[PDB]
Symmetry: D2
Subunit: 231 residues, 4 copies
């Protein structure tokens, strides 16, 4: 029953539910089946950066994911978020593992949202063990090497399967308003995805939800902690 808009960094192609047949970034409007995707050369054990932008003038959600010294992956999609989301939302990071797995480690996260001005800005370049400005859901924890581990990792530092977790910014965010002339947001995060396997799964997403969003039961694996099913 939640409403979700997300940008997904999908490490595991589930072609049975529409993923293209490679690792990819996508834009998800109310479904795990991305409205748009682009090919992504995920680099195991390397630190990448994701950058998500939107404004109400162009009505265009874009994302760029990059690693140092590599060509970046970019995806864009036309959508007026006033038609999808409620006026007030929470914003968050989600990740999952399944039969296959990976660390879903978040090293930094920033966000800015403006409504013309009213503004909200936060930045985490370090997460503490007791991060009262985050709502941690599922298996997500903070504080180990000052990072946000969205899914379960053991002490020896090895990722566990079938895990799901999220972190939402505590304050509601006014993401759109009819009376506003311009609304915009941007989000940045740095992430470290490492697998012992060879086959990493399942991904990390930046998402925007109704304020009371919770992890749907069963949303491990291909469902990214975002959706109750694959419709």
């Amino acid at each position: 029953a939640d409403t979700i808009v997300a940008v997904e960094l999908d490490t595991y192609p589930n072609t049975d539910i529409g993923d293209p047949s490679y690792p990819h970034i996508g834009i998800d409007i109310k479904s795990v089946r991305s409205k748009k995707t682009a090919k992504w050369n995920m680099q195991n054990g390397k630190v990448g950066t994701a950058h998500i932008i939107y404004n109400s003038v162009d009505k265009r959600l874009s994302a760029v994911v990059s690693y140092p010294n590599a060509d970046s992956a970019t995806v864009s999609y036309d959508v007026d978020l006033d038609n999808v989301l409620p006026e007030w939302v929470r914003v968050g990071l989600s990740a999952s593992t399944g039969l296959y797995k990976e660390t879903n480690t978040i090293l930094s996260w920033s966000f800015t949202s403006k409504l013309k001005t009213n503004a909200l800005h936060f930045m985490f370049n370090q997460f503490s063990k007791d991060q009262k400005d985050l709502i941690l859901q599922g298996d997500a924890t903070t504080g180990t090497d000052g990072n946000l581990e969205l899914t379960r990792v053991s002490s020896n530092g090895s990722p566990q399967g079938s895990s799901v977790g999220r972190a939402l910014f505590y304050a509601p965010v006014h993401i759109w308003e009819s009376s506003a002339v311009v609304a915009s947001f941007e989000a940045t995060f740095t992430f470290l995805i490492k697998s012992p396997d060879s086959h990493p799964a399942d991904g990390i997403a930046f998402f925007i939800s109704n304020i009371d969003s919770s992890i749907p039961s069963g949303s491990t694996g291909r469902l990214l902690g975002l959706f109750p099913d694959a419709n």
Copy 2:
């Protein structure tokens, strides 16, 4: 029992509880009896600005209150907030009326905090009828002309006695941390205090509190919605 740090814009001298005998600005560290005050030439019905700053290097809380084309009032007090406040806090605006009254209208409020870097910034230049990133307490309301009315005003614009209200930012703020090299915050608000009669009361404060802080029982009047008694 709440922990409070506040900067008060005190319109009504209660000489019997240690107010000086003129309107004043004050720094309150866990007591309504200001640790330092300065004379404040309040201007009934004009828009004022208050600016509050602190950093962990100087460990000095200062405040400056001004009106266009008038001399500003400044107060400062040396205090190590590390030994006063909890590590995580909420920030807020509070006001009250008693036997005597006034409007306690907030036209704008911004805050920035930094911990080295993690950061939180917000800015309100307009308040809406349903401002979900604020916790309104007591008599506080939003949406009347796009402003925050901290105390009761009638439909005819006139302020009411025996009122108390507060507005806190929804997200906790990490105000200090021992591992941190430098911590700083600042806050700015613009306010409009009108009274029909001579003699307005009781005042406006910017405050910092334990996360779960609430209006103390009985704290209309002299206690500014901050303190349970006049100790």
Copy 3:
């Protein structure tokens, strides 16, 4: 070499303006690559907001007044192919046979590349504003405002004026190795006339770091263009 967003108050149909006040995106020519109709409000304070990023490669602008519907215009353009890597940014305005005040009450700009950034904000302009280059008739400090074109002691705008203000620091507007490049500008303006016939308009622009007012660019050319091609 000019990219600009014009707030065109005077229809010059002679050279391809539409028959109504318009906003437009100008890429190297006063003949806008895209326009939109604009219900300019004579003597009210307006706001212009301009945005571009290198992911979308879309230059967009919105102009509005309180309690009025806004005007918006966009144009796809890759600034990598139109501007040098380093530029200056500014505001320009003109009058000719008709006239208007071209008063700037505020101006802010942010640019970002990858992370390198520049931000500035003027809400008040001073008599001797050393981080601006004033060109032509532009002056600062009267009531704390920037007057891009001539105004008399009592406030009457003068015909045949041109003036501009550029931020003193060069701006790094694109770099081929950047992941994301972006800018935004916002200004608030007061364009007033003693009749209808107000002219000629205000523009936010991006040029070469040595750009000066081209010769004979009063009027229709908004202080931006050497000819009407």
Copy 4:
């Protein structure tokens, strides 16, 4: 002569001109002889961060310098900049070497200044310095681009630092640092740096400075004078 206000990270103790006998950070108001200093445990080859703050309410120039996992050094001095500097300035980083030497490598530099009277502001941030960085004025031996860093003083192709070098980098736009009619004025600066040396007592240091707009390196200002002062008065 130029008017200079500076926060110095002084690696070399020139006790004959008033340095304490240890590496130190200090506040310099028109003289290389600091108004105030604190001991600084400089760490050869580690990346350090410096943070400089000032506001016109408290009128106290403070600085904190630090390294990961070490205690930071801090220094503060009460001084009203309105009395010392002209109203418009440029801001800069300077460094020098002498008989002894060190890399004076700047990896990042950010600055913000604000004035009220509803505010004017200027912010810049460099996390990368490019070969041809037109919003910087480079003076003396200073160069940009090598590994995207700003090298204030001369380093050989094999990365070894040279003695007797001086260089500076100033932001191109003038800064409105104070104004008569301002309710509050403030600035902060942050930079990260790498000082590596072969020698046992590295020299001479790095400084964040604020100067007249037309400031240039004074004659004879290598070594202990940090590219900032014509002499040791």
